[PDB]
Amino acid sequence: EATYNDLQVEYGKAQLQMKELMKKFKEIQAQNFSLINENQSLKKNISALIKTARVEINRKDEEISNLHL
Amino acid sequence: ATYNDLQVEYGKAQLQMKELMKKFKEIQAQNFSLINENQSLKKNISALIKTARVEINRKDEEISNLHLEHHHHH
């Protein structure tokens, strides 16, 4: 049978564990937020790069063909 | 606080910590997927920049050569 003081002791231990666990949760939530932002910007970066690259290669191929013609 | 009130608060703290641990593992799995996906996107971008540069540079030199060939014959 848990005593009144034992419940007070365990409650304090639980708050210390809870504070420690809440710190780790906010940390991994912070990491989640930056990882998602990095994910979305990398997709926007690789998309603009593909468009920039194909546009410039086409334009260069048009010069080469006209010069040959 | 009464003895039963203490049992309740203690039990409630335990249950909040279990709920918190569950959400932690959920988010951790998300971050593992995002780290994996971001690393590959960064390798894609490096590969694509390299190959586009090779193409553009090669195109620039063919354009240069064709202009110099023309002038040399005019």
Residue numbers in the entry:
A (entry chain B): 70 to 138
B (entry chain A): 71 to 144
From the publication, what sentences describe this entry?
FLASH, Flice-associated huge protein, was originally discovered as a protein involved in Fas-mediated apoptosis and later in regulation of expression of several genes, including oncogenes. Subsequent studies showed that FLASH localizes to Histone Locus Bodies in the nucleus, suggesting a role in expression of histone genes, and that it is essential for histone pre-mRNA processing.
To rule out the possibility that the observed FLASH NTD dimer is a crystallographic artifact caused by oxidized cysteine residues, we determined the structures of the FLASH NTD C54S/C83A double mutant in two different crystal forms at 2.1 and 2.6 Å resolution, respectively. In addition to Cys83, we also mutated the other Cys residue in the FLASH NTD, Cys54, in case it formed a disulfide as well even though the residue was disordered in the structure. The two structures adopt the same coiled-coil dimer as the wild-type FLASH NTD, confirming that FLASH NTD dimer formation does not require the Cys83 disulfide. The individual protomers of these two mutant dimers also show differences, similar to those observed for the wild-type dimer. Interestingly, residues 53–70 from one of the protomers in the structure at 2.6 Å resolution are stabilized by crystal packing, showing strong electron density corresponding to an α-helix. The other protomer showed weak electron density for residues 56–62, while residues 51–55 and 63–66 are not observed. Our AUC results showed that wild-type FLASH NTD and the FLASH NTD C54S/C83A double mutant have similar sedimentation coefficients of 1.61 and 1.59 and frictional ratios of 1.81 and 1.86, consistent with them forming dimers in solution.
